[PDB]
Amino acid sequence: SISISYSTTYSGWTVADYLADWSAYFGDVNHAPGQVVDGSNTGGFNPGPFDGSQYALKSTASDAAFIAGGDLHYTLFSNPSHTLWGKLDSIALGDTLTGGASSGGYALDSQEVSFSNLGLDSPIAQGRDGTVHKVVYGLMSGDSSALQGQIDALLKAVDPSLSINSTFDQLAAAGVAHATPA
Numbered sequence: 816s817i818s819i820s821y822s823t824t825y826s827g828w829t830v831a832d833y834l835a836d837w838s839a840y841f842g843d844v845n846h847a848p849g850q851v852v853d854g855s856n857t858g859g860f861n862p863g864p865f866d867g868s869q870y871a872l873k874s875t876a877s878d879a880a881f882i883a884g885g886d887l888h889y890t891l892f893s894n895p896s897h898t899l900w901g902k903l904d905s906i907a908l909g910d911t912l913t914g915g916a917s918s919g920g921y922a923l924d925s926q927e928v929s930f931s932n933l934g935l936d937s938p939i940a941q942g943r944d945g946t947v948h949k950v951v952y953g954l955m956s957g958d959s960s961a962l963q964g965q966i967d968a969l970l971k972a973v974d975p976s977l978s979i980n981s982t983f984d985q986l987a988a989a990g991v992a993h994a995t996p997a
């Protein structure tokens with residue numbers, strides 16, 4: 816089942832409100848044709864260059880950042896082009912990205928919320944339709960809708976009274992979330 820970790824700062828927020836606010840603030844990095852700039856809006860893989868156990872990206876306008884964890888593969892120019900696929904186990908959101916391949920991994924100096932045990936897997940053949948791609952490219956583009964939909968389904972699978980409209984504290988009481996210090 817999904818497992819959520821949240822800073823106590825967000826105890827009274829709904830998951831949906833938190834994600835809407837976080838993604839709007841992170842913004843759209845404009846990772847799109849004619850606009851990709853290495854070291855600005857590509858993000859990076861650990862160990863990389865285009866595959867690994869983590870993909871991480873900092874916003875182009877602030878130190879907000881996320882880390883996707885699992886067993887990830889980015890096709891780049893290979894068919895189907897520009898597809899992130901593989902196994903997505905976790906998404907961590909916060910600010911102040913640290914580390915990288917040369918450090919052995921990425922971390923957030925302020926990790927606000929993480930969603931783990933997501934159990935998502937997308938085959939290469941689905942291309943940019945795959946859930947993994949939609950979740951992560953959504954975040955890159957300042958749009959948490961795809962992530963929200965996957966979290967909502969995972970919460971319903973625990974109990975249909977649980978949803979992204981639950982607060983983090985409600986989810987803790989329901990056995991799927993735990994608080995961390997602010």
Ligand code: HEM
Nearest residue numbers: 846847848849850851857858859870889897899948951952
């Ligand atoms: C890991 C998550 C990533 C996702 C979900 C993603 C997604 C995409 C998407 C949707 C496009 C647009 C394709 C098109 O419309 O033609 C694209 C283009 C591109 N991506 Fe990514 N990308 C990711 C990572 C990276 C990384 C790590 C690099 C390089 C270090 C990269 C380099 C490029 C380049 C060079 C283009 C084409 C830009 C151009 O045509 O001018 N991407 N990517």
Ligand code: NA
Nearest residue numbers: 890891892893
């Ligand atoms: Na490739």
Ligand code: NA
Nearest residue numbers: 938939940941
């Ligand atoms: Na496939």
Ligand code: NA
Nearest residue numbers: 968971972973
């Ligand atoms: Na269900």
Ligand code: NA
Nearest residue numbers: 985986988989
């Ligand atoms: Na509850």
